[PDB]
């Protein structure tokens, strides 16, 4: 198979007969989808599965030197989305949704019921292992080898999301944005809510620099792939250096 | 991900623990575990597309199918990625699961992590019962127990 | 197939179960393409080949009163275009092109060589009959029964386009817009250029009110359908009350 | 349009006059006339799509085909609207044409007025010579003489 990008080579092109020759070398070759040759730019974009070595040799086989200057894929995709459902021993239950707004900004938004009113630590942990309730889930997610922190700290565990407040009726409603967390990087890991407050590393307790002294882990879910509201984009029309895409919301 | 894990649960007495392990990059995946609480006989065993179980098997949706094919057994060339066939539940209602499969992966475009594993009510007819429903679900019918496949140590 | 317009009926609709019933009457009937049901508007658009009688009866067959309030077809089309090539016995040759800018404004633009310098009458005539040179072509095109005139006169023959000037070298280059002439209405008729000046009905000759005394007819062509620069539009995408169309120029 | 007319001409000796007449709305069209200057034998006889002959048969373009079908004889169900088959040119080089055809019209979507009538070099194979060119042109090849079909008194 080999998967297709678009390859951009730069070629010294001047006459229409040179352009005739460049197209000639890739005209109906095995595994080249589309060729496009911007003669103002002196450039040749190549929609193909083939390696850059092989394709450069076919252009150079005519007798022209073909310097590669870029590779890309005008495929478009949706922002990523996910959900974690929190359950465990007894009262605590909740749903938390994730949406990658930009590749640098993730939006987290959810609702957790049955909490002893006040502040509770919320953290992404390393494993999505619910075998032993919330204790099989491993540590705070920490691929950068940082010390535990609060969400307003540069030095923190990726998984550190600080605290959420349970109201009067034992219920936490929250929205937050986090720049170190990324939906693609946590699918299959776990979200966990804690017995009591995360001290954000500012407790001077032995656990502060490690868990923020948050207590027992009450409830956990796996951060699971969700369908978006929207379907995958579809190309409806193309030209030289233009594509037109449709994006329809899902039925239900 | 070398290893992953799933904890099956539902409303009924069906429950269990399934492990996944993969030793080579786009190699085979060993699938193994146990499931108590089942009726005796064969039960369908499927990775559905999404892990979102906020709305049950309507939100988890169909069999995981990135190559738009018809339903089949694991041994068929024409199959969904998620099709792992059947598990044998004994007289006591336990199924000791053991499977090897090189179409699912723990990475790349066939990665099952973050999706829902499901043990279904009836047996998987492997797409061979000859009707419209047979080539979507293999007439295994309703979900008994399900869980999100998560990363494991 | 070809008789596929879109029919709009107004229906007393209140509940979603009434809408369920309306769709029910047209669900999979022979020859109905698409149904669409704006319940804010209490309206039902019906993409179908069927007659309005028949479709009203199917809606009314449930027992509900279905007043028709419009018909249309969201098919899109190109502005119309045409060309006449002028030849004859003698020296004179030329090409004149027509383009219907708006349904009220036609653009005429052309070039005619081999003319005795100065002003020559140019007119669309009734028939595209080149059997007897330019004399088989009939009169000035005059479907509204007007008297001959110049292009700045309301009362004139549709076919009256006034005069064009042959320069130094016996060559007429001209552009004009005419609001009475219409490309669709002259395909298959003839364009003719004349020996001498059209007097615009102001000559006091017996021919003034009839031909403007323009002389022998030197050269004529039939006003022929031309491909135009652009291809027929193509629908690339639709939804409820939206369609997206592509329009590409011709390659060659 | 009840009646129409075409005057065929080229560079070579081929020339002629063809009349059209239609008495009922979507009725048949009588086609009749003569063409001198032809080689003996059969010659293709086609209404091409456009009447624009600024660039010859490249601007007049293909056989008039509003229903996107394959080339055929006039007697075939599968045909272009413009396909009127062949004319028989005798020893002296004259073809006395006389035809009836109910697929062309002088009105509506199959209206030939404003399009180019063409007598071609070789005979029309009626799409039956079995190749890609046979189902576009019927291998009648190049234009001999042509003219725009115009409205007639
Ligand atoms: Zn931490
Ligand atoms: Zn399946
Ligand atoms: Zn006049
Ligand atoms: Zn044809």
Author numbering:
A (entry chain A), C (entry chain C): 8 to 259
B (entry chain B), D (entry chain D): 1 to 153
Paper text:
Superoxide dismutase-1 (SOD1) is one of the most abundant human proteins and is an important part of our antioxidant, redox signalling and respiratory control mechanisms. SOD1 folding, zinc and copper acquisition, and disulphide bond formation can be catalysed by the copper chaperone for SOD1 (CCS), which forms a transient heterodimeric complex with SOD1 to facilitate its maturation. Here, we discover the mechanisms that govern SOD1 maturation and stabilisation through interaction with the chaperone protein hCCS. Combinations of mutants yielded crystallographic structures of full-length hCCS in two different conformers complexed with hSOD1; an hCCS domain II truncation complexed with hSOD1; an hCCS domain II homodimer structure at higher resolution than previously available (1.55 Å); and the hSOD1 disulphide knock-out mutant used to promote complexation.
From a conformation that facilitates copper acquisition from Ctr1/Ctr2 or Atox1, hCCS domain I must move to a position that enables transfer to hSOD1. The very high positional dynamism necessary of the hCCS copper-binding domain is evidenced by intra-lattice conformational flexibility and a 47.4-Å domain movement between conformers. Conformational plasticity is therefore not restricted to the hCCS homodimer state but is an intrinsic property of the activating complex. Comparison of different hCCS conformers indicate that the C-terminal tail is also conformationally dynamic, as has been observed for the yeast orthologue and predicted from SAXS data for hCCS. When hCCS domain I is free to move within the lattice or inhabits the extended conformer, the position of domain III is partially or entirely unrestricted. In the latter case, it forms the interface of a supramolecule comprising four hCCS monomers and four hSOD1 monomers in crystallo. The SOD1-like, hCCS domain II found within each complex structure has an intact intra-subunit disulphide bond in contrast to the yeast orthologue.
